[PDB]
Amino acid sequence: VVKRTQQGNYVPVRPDHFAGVSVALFFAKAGHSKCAQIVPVVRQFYKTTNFSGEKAVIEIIYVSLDKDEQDFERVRALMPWCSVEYKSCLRKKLIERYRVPNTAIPLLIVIGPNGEEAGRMNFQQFVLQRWDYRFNKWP
Amino acid sequence: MREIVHVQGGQCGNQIGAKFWEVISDEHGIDPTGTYCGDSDLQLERINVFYNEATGGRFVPRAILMDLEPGTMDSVRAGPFGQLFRPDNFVFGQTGAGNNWAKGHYTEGAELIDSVLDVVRKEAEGCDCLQGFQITHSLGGGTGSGMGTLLISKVREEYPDRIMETFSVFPSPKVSDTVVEPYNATLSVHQLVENADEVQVIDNEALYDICFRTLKLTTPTYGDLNHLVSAAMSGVTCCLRFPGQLNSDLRKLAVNLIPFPRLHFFLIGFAPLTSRGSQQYRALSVPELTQQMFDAKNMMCASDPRHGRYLTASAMFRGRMSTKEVDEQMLNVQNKNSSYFVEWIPNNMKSSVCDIPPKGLKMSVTFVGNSTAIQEMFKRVSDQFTAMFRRKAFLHWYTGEGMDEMEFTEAESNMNDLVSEYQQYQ
Amino acid sequence: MREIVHVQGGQCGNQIGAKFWEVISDEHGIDPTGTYCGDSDLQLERINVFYNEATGGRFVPRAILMDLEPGTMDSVRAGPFGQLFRPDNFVFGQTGAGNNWAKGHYTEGAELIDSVLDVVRKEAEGCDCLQGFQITHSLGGGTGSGMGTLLISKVREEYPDRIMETFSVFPSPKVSDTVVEPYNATLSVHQLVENADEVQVIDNEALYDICFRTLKLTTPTYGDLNHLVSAAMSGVTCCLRFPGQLNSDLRKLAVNLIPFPRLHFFLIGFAPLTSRGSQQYRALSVPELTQQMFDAKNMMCASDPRHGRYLTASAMFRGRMSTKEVDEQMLNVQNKNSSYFVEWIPNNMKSSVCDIPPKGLKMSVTFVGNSTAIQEMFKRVSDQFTAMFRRKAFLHWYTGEGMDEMEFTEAESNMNDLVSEYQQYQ
Amino acid sequence: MREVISIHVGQAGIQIGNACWELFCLEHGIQPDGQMPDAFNTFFSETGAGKHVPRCVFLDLEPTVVDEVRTGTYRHLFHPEQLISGKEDAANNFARGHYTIGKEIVDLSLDRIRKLADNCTGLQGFLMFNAVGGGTGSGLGCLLLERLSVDYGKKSKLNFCSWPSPQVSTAVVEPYNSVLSTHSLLEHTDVAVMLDNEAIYDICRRNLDIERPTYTNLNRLIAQVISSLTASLRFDGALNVDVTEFQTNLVPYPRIHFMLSSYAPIISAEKAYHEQLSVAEITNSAFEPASMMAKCDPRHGKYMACCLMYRGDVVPKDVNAAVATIKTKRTIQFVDWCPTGFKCGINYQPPTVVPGGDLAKVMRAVCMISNSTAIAEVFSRMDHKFDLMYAKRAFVHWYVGEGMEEGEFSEAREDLAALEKDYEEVGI
Amino acid sequence: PTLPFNAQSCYRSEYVAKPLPP
Amino acid sequence: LPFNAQSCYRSEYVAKPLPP
Amino acid sequence: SQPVFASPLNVEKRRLNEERALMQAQKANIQLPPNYGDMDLILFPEGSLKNSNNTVIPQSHLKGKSVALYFADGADPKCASLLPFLLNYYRTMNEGGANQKIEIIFVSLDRDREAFESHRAHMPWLSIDLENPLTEILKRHFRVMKEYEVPTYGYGSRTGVPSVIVIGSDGREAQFLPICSGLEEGDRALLRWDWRNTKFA
Ligand SMILES: Nc1nc2c(ncn2[C@@H]2O[C@H](COP(=O)(O)OP(=O)(O)OP(=O)(O)O)[C@@H](O)[C@H]2O)c(=O)[nH]1
Ligand SMILES: Nc1nc2c(ncn2[C@@H]2O[C@H](COP(=O)(O)OP(=O)(O)O)[C@@H](O)[C@H]2O)c(=O)[nH]1
Ligand SMILES: Nc1nc2c(ncn2[C@@H]2O[C@H](COP(=O)(O)OP(=O)(O)O)[C@@H](O)[C@H]2O)c(=O)[nH]1
Ligand SMILES: [Mg+2]
Incomplete structure (x- = not known):
């Protein structure tokens, strides 16, 4: 999916x-x-x-x-990480959930095991490093 | 970071600079609309050397376009890659500095200094802390050599310690345009020796000689003449923008090239320059590029370098070449051309290796050297100026404009002494 | 909760006041048919501050619309956003004060103030608890400066503890219409300074400079000019309406920006202001915002604030925005421009941040300032009033409607000391 | 407690250090995140749960070499703020890095090295890494040498200075950038090793048989000498020699502490198969004059001291026989006042070869550090390059305009002339 | 022409439901 | 035209495998 | 993760091995995600390698030899220069002694089947037919690009035609022989091969 x-x-x-x-x-x-x-x-x-x-x-x-x-x-052909299918409804629900208008984009939200928001960082202007991988270990 | 602020002045400089941002943007991968394309992190991590981000994600060049005749700015906008510049950065004029060096520098020269210094100040202070000031202009015409050269002196008193460079074309030896060139070049050389750090000379008749032999082109317009000067322009600031095995800056090139504070005029050369027929049958190797290095028919300058000894020359190699084959070839070219260097400096060559070749080619090198044979244009323009002034010709539109005869006698005394120091060191 | 009653007077007020019910209309997303579209809570949360429910879901503005001629009244309800107002709040005059302040305040306004003040009571006392009143009018005119200034006096006599915030367009500095300017300005100031809590001044020659130099509009219409002053007039009362990080109201502004109860004539500016082709190019930052804001060219007051000192100043920012560059740049301006600020109130600067910016932009600022460079109006209007009174020019209409020469002496004297008591603190 | 601290200054020192912390990672098998899957303690620090952060500081005002370390795959190896990088390069000038653009980051670097130094107590030595031919390595590295000299004066300081070549320059101000460094580095560091770029070029054309190498092939083979020098600090051996005993065993007189270097074997997979590497010839190839690292032909010199750290499967009883062969050989002449001049060391660890490299997995190797009276030729030509350049005053005007006044050109020249005549005073 | 609303308050933007600890 | 040039450091110091 | 992550052999290997590890965990404490030494792959499928006389040979034959992939083109002048030297090196280096030391797998970038077969007839070592997709997966897996026709995921092109590279057991690339590279030692770097150490297993 x-x-x-x-x-x-x-x-x-x-x-x-x-x-x-x-x-x-x-x-x-x-x-x-x-x-x-x-x-x-x-x-x-x-x-x-x-x-x-x-x-x-x-x-x-x-x-x-x-x-x-x-x-x-x-652009998926350039993207090396994982993505989601266009025709699926999860992309639409996720964008209508995590409060992203169609100049805030691009932005990153690290989440947790429950899927709720654990950290937000935008890029409107060295800020990629503010996320630590040691934060959201999952069980 | 360090950012270079660009000034485009004169009829000539605005055309050369138009091709400059043409060739920088597509090797850095920025569309004429300002957006980036290419997906290469090295092309991006130092983009602020020449660009400012615009809070839409698009870029804008840090170039100030300045002239006194409104036609050429509309020509730059109408050209491709012309929407990049900010319309507030355009400072037009309407009188037209009619090829009279005085009136480009005082008469209507003064009335745009307020606007052009105000817009460069806004660009200069908003950044981190800048490094240098490259300007593109002409020493033959009027508004290139008056209006921009006053922008030299007003900026250098404003920032005394920062570096600045000029890519100035010169009067041709054989056939001149703008028949008052001897007055223009001699009145602009004694502002450059006082207020300029490096003056990279381009000479137009030698550029055609490049299109004579080493390119075998047929009908070269002002597109590909300016396109090959822009290649040398991108080569001298290539090593700032990108990493490499031996990184070198604009100021570090100035540390080791200018031996004494006055003589800082530079002959430029670019390799490879191949005809399209011979492009298949040619080995592009470090010992082969270094032979077009010291080719008298390859220099952008018009003088014959074989009639003098280079005092100090530098070579910005670009590409993934072996370091040994570089510095041995510099010693190879030094030992057998021993009579063509000066002896009281050991190991005259400077070399610097970056790791990014220009677009469409595998290896390149830009030559920036200091010859004692550059005295020819400082001698050929000199006896041009002393000939006309001996019968007092054409001076009534200078003397009628504000410059009386004290500085003209001063201006020749500057430049002919510059001939004396070059001969003193040989 | 809190409501602001918006009372309109004159042709100039009513053309300006139409734009308030255009810029507040689309900021809150009210539809000129009455309803709401824009499907977000945060506009609808605090909307009783300017609108009223009507048991059909439509939102009638709490606006009081008075004038002595019906021609401007026709222009209000015919244009866009014209069906919004309640017709009962339209109160007419038939005769028209022919730019005579006497009949504006004594002859024609006498039999209409009893009617327009009845309509204010229904809106004012009809709510739970009111905050303040705001007024838009002129000073050159008769129907605006007469009935407007009469209304301020008669409404302070009922609500003495509430706030007054009034725009009044002054006479032009250089060239002005309506030759009884000083008899309509001086006779309205000396009752303005005793009845108005806060007045901040707008000049039509000031907006001429802004829309031509900054907005670069070759054909500025009053439709454009009123839109610009209406843009700021949202910004001084915006932080009532939207939640923020450092909340401010008008009383917040009133307790802080008026040291002594005499001097409360402010200055207005606005940033960002760039032309149509420069919204794509400029980097919208707080550091460039504060540079645009402390410029005389930004100011909607036709004066030079660098000729005097800013006694107290305040900037109301809007938008999602970091609070360092708010605070530290207000520090930076106060420490660079030393003589441009008064000494014995150190750290003269009030900053307020509201989270929701106006539509179209992402960051905006509205700037107010109580300056002692406002001498130049009160001196210019006084000596024009002094010269035009020394030999009794045009008095016989003011004396014709029931004044005396003694009210004209006091109107000079009540505003003559106002010139000195700004000079006392410079 | 007893550990060592490494300082990399200037982009040569960064890239030499870059390859140095390649081999160090691969020897102890640390994964480039920072945690392996107490020999490691002599160079690293336990940052909690298995993470190791190295004890190195990178210092360059040229931001274009530190950032490419920052963006490179070793980004999480280093604690994110030992990599301190200024605003603009010192630009090949001694005066620029020592005076003007030096001071705003020296205080940050001094404050950087302090908490590293007092992580433990009784720390052993200091490891410089710089190009003495350029600007921000020579002038700035001096400042980090002199400021550390007054603070931590009971500590040894080891320098690894890439001395400028006789024929190769790649910078025309190197004659000026040497003599203005040699005075201000001689009496301030304890121990320094000459390395020359064209000498290691002649190494790699002859032994390893590559005609056209890269600086990355230079520094990787310099890094082999570095790790083999500090191997006794790291790894247990039969007879081990530490950093603290180089004034003890290598420095005859207090000024004279300039040493050459050598390495053997340096062979490819080419001729590793075709040659067995016995201890008879690896000590013969070590002293072979076309196998040092600094051009210095020792036929017109006299040896004074030598320190051999054999590593790998070496038995000590043929070490004694092998060194006895050399003393009997007549082409090498030790100085008359020094009867014994061989110090032997044996470590149990074979040298390691980096994957995808160009050195072969040898069984046993020797790293040699020597004092000879042949450094007279080394300091003579860089005296001879200086006195011609200054003979009628070239390039002076950026030195004078920046802060170095006239006279330091003079006083350093007889400072070097003192150093040259001291070496000739020794050998008689 | 109309224009959509695309802004939020600070408290509503950041004080969201947050992950509960294990 | 595409861009196909990389620095020395990035194209060389790949994460080498750990020795056994 | 060797040589490059943006490579179909690596991603299919980790897909298959992650599926195997998840199946083992469901059947039965094991580490997720597994270490790089934990992934094991049969690198060459059955119908891949064919010798002269066109007989398909299993991967298990390659044990105890130093194996190199040779990416080559029929029309390339540098390939035409390289082939005779490499034939003589194979000839001498492999007839000297008792074992078959080196072995070469030929992958073609040729412009059709006719060119592939005609250039293949000149060579005595093994080859992979062009119809099987393993050629395309292999050439992108080693990022050996002829011209910029296939986009990359940020990885720079190491080398192009001709290229020789010696292989390890887990698909790890051992070394590129410097024929057309930064060293550029044409027809002479073929003897840089380390056949003692590089042993397929
Ligand atoms: N062995 C070795 N030497 C290097 C390397 N890189 C540069 N060098 C030497 O460095 C000398 C020039 O000085 P640089 O290190 O480039 O610059 P610097 O010494 O830091 O001074 P700046 O000009 O201010 O950057 C050259 O003569 C080279 O011999 C390297 O990677 N390995
Ligand atoms: N290389 C080059 N030179 C030019 C170009 N256009 C004009 N020039 C030179 O400009 C010189 C005269 O200066 P010009 O720019 O025309 O006068 P200006 O109006 O004062 O700037 C002539 O000698 C021309 O050779 C151009 O496109 N390329
Ligand atoms: N800014 C602005 N000023 C106006 C406008 N219309 C009139 N005025 C000014 O109003 C002054 C005349 O006073 P006015 O208000 O029109 O008289 P009244 O309406 O009868 O009280 C003139 O000096 C105009 O400059 C307008 O639309 N915008
Ligand atoms: Mg440096």
């Missing part, structure tokens, strides 16, 4: 994949000016922070406010 990547065919992620990691929701829409410079820095942070441990410690869920399925697909 929620999607991880694989080249050639699209594979869904396990619900037990998120065990013991910290999950950050990442809001972006393609063609937006600020999203194009928020994507690469959080890409580099994903790679560096999560791929020294033999156990991965973070996870980033991609939510797109795009207007087109093909545009969302071509």
